[PDB]
Amino acid sequence: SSEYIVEKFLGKRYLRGRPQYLTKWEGYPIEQCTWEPLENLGKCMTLIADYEAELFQQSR
């Protein structure tokens, strides 16, 4: 009832010590992105691993 399609991630944070990702949903404006817990992003692992790889480069 509350599942949507992930397009991209737009940020990372820790909330009470736990990793979250700022999640851009396909078919919704960027204004509607939401912070999501990493444990809920299991079906998005290519997106996650690619995003972590992007961050590692950008953070040289």
């Binding site: 509350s2 599942e3 949507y4 399609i5 992930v6 999640t23 949903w25 939401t34 912070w35 999501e36 809920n40 992003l41 299991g42 079906k43 998005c44 290519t46 997106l47």
Partner: peptide, 8 residues
Amino acid sequence: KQTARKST
């Protein structure tokens, strides 16, 4: 298609 629950 990569999906996930959305927080509200």
